[PDB]
RNA sequence: UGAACUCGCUGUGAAGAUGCAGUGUACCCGCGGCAAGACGGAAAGACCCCGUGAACCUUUACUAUAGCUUGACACUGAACA
Ligand SMILES: [Mg+2]
């Protein structure tokens with residue numbers, strides 16, 4: 001499938017680019033996720049007409065919004081006193097839903113799917129390093145303090 | 149249930165005769181019995197054979213097929229070795 005882009009995806013295409021990609025990748029991933037649209041002759045003519053002078057600006061303001069969201073909190077200890085057992089060995093395993101609710105209780109607007117983790121379970125108490133995926137380009141590393 | 153004025157023997161005869169030949173006996177007709185014969189009645193022999201007949205059934209008969217299994221392509225992607 002010949003497809004014209006709207007986002008800096010990693011390995012296939014640059015911005016404003018019409019690349020030929022596998023049709024499953026074009027159908028299930030790009031056109032739902034809002035990064036690419038099918039290279040109809042009308043579509044590439046319409047993109048050269050108006051949308052190339054807007055989607056770059058939208059990418060710049062999205063990168064700025066990711067910078068704003070990542071630096072409204074970087075203090076790197078969010079306190080959760082969830083339930084635990086004695087001397088390590090957390091009671092019930094922590095969901096990233098709960099980690100999302102903790103940081104949106106004190107700070108950022110980051111939801112569940114905007115959060116990555118090495119483990120994802122955080123099944124003991126201590127300084128567990130948490131990553132973040134508010135965008136595929138930029139990360140953020142704000143750390144958690146879980147206690148009983 | 150072809151029609152009957154439907155005896156016995158010996159012989160002849162699709163080769164085991166109430167019906168032919170030869171011969172012996174028997175007046176016409178019931179009734180109650182028996183059941184040897186009328187190749188008695190019943191049922192186009194059920195065993196056998198024939199049909200370039202049928203059915204089911206078996207299998208290492210033939211040719212197929214549902215199924216189960218194999219691989220290619222599609223639905224079907226991204227990375228990294
Ligand atoms: Mg005789």
Ligand SMILES: [Mg+2]
Nearest residue numbers: 183184185186
């Ligand atoms: Mg008699």
Ligand SMILES: [Mg+2]
Nearest residue numbers: 180181182183
């Ligand atoms: Mg009697």
Ligand SMILES: [Mg+2]
Nearest residue numbers: 187188189190
């Ligand atoms: Mg008879």
Ligand SMILES: [Mg+2]
Nearest residue numbers: 191192193194
């Ligand atoms: Mg017959």
